[PDB]
Amino acid sequence: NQFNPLVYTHGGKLERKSKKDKTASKVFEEFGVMEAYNCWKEASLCIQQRDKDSVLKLVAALNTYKDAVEPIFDSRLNSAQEVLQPSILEEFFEYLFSRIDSIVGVNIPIRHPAKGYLSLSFNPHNIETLIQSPEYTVRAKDHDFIIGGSAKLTIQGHGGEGETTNIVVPAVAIECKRYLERNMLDECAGTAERLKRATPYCLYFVVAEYLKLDDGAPELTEIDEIYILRHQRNSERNKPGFKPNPIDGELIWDLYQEVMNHLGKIWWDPNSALQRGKVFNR
Amino acid sequence: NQFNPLVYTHGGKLERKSKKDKTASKVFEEFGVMEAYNCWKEASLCIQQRDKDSVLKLVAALNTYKDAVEPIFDSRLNSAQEVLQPSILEEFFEYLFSRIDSIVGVNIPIRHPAKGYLSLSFNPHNIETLIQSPEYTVRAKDHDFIIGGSAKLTIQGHGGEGETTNIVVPAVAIECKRYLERNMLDECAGTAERLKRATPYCLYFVVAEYLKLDDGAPELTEIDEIYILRHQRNSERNKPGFKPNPIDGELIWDLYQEVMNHLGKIWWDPNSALQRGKVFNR
């Protein structure tokens, strides 16, 4: 009865790039990225409770890690921008949610970036294959972080021989962005629509550090919540004297509490609806 | 090597209503509906080739049958309006397509009204069921006539025990209406969208006898074709001296040819696309 569902998305990317790119590899050793990373991981794994103080401590270790390596990524690895930096928040959510198993009372197989099921459609080759074994496509969207189940989907026609696809059915999906612009918000908007049709009980969050939007009015349809972890606008970053606010631990605490509440609930509970008088509660 | 895939949707409805409603039952005997029906069926089954002349003859038998029983339905059974009349065209398409098996070279299981697959979504009860055996819903739309395959869809979670649903995957879908108004056209419009997403190679037709639309500009998006079999507007029907044009056999011939052409084709054929230079041909 435990978990051991940690994948270390960011560590894996550091290892890849180290081998995939030697030049990166040189920078990582010279500027101590691998030891800063190992320290972040060790410190996170050492925080085992999930009361408010513990969560603030995880966020303090995250702030330290980003303060260490982000300046190296930004100034000494131009090519490795969205190759290494985005996976840091993803790995952070792997730590934050690594101890849900005993609380929720089940072993959750998916706690990492994954392709969340969106739809099934049939594209048979001809009439004979339509009858015998209809070809199909399962559509899925990459999300930066999913908590969810894995399932096998099988289709069989008259021929009787099945074709199976493995899918991921999210209970929570989180996108992680360094800043939130307009083209990416619209893309999340349209993804949230598809996701709530595929999986109406999936909570969908957008998490950003900085907000980079103009006058334009955004559409927040079906996105459950959007976080701006540093309470800063992205234009501040290039100004003389800029100093980044730290990622706000209070917001991570909020997010952690919202996720747990969602995981612990029966999502459609008719008798509860009737007793309450309202289908959705606080 | 044959077919025997006829279901007699309309005959079945006559039998139901006869037992479900005795009053109907009385009218059917008194006004000879059952013998007119048996004659239509016998005459249709006797036309076995599918050259143009044979198809015109099937349509002549259809015209005769409707000339016989529609006035009885309209004037002596108010309740049984869309209870018995709509199934006549459906049964007609059962006859027209009853001899496709040898041409297409496969036994097509579905040639009758059915629920055509639209989508699969997951609505798990709780986190434990999400992991172990995620509850799901398959959405489907009733169509007045489908030519297509039947398939079994299975979902399995960590528990390993599958849940199966039987579905219908249409290659052709036809809606049959006595007249085409605005609320029903819009409903078909929105269904065609869903259907082309679920099954992009399904041909979707709307077949009506009369057109009952005003100035309003209709949206014909993704509907492959709409037929007005009597080349009449629905307002003509209540005028003194009105006489209905017969259902036009030339239009049924067109429809028959379009369906067969579609059934005989490979729907996505890359090398054919490349050779032709255009993905869609005449």
Numbering used by the authors:
A (entry chain A), B (entry chain A): 3 to 284
What did the article's authors report about this structure?
BbvCI, a Type IIT restriction endonuclease, recognizes and cleaves the seven base pair sequence 5′-CCTCAGC-3′, generating 3-base, 5′-overhangs.
Purified samples of wild-type BbvCI, containing a 1:1 ratio of R1 and R2 subunits yielded crystals under acidic conditions (pH 4.5) in the presence of an excess of duplex DNA oligo containing the target site, and 2 mM calcium chloride. We initially calculated MIR phases, built an initial structure, and conducted refinements using datasets corresponding to the latter (heavy-atom) space group, and then subsequently determined the final, higher resolution structure of the native (non-derivatized) protein in the original C222 space group via molecular replacement and phase extension. The resulting electron density maps clearly corresponded to two full-length protein chains, but no density corresponding to DNA was present. In contrast, modeling the electron density as a homodimer comprising two copies of the R2 subunit resulted in satisfactory values for Rwork and Rfree (0.189/0.249, respectively), excellent correlation of the model to experimental electron density, and significantly improved geometric quality. The molecule is saddle-shaped due to deep concave surfaces at the dimer interface, and there is no obvious region of contiguous positive surface charge that might accommodate a DNA duplex of seven or more base pairs. Within each R2 subunit, the PD-(D/E)XK catalytic site occurs in its customary position, at the termini of adjacent beta-strands in the core domain.
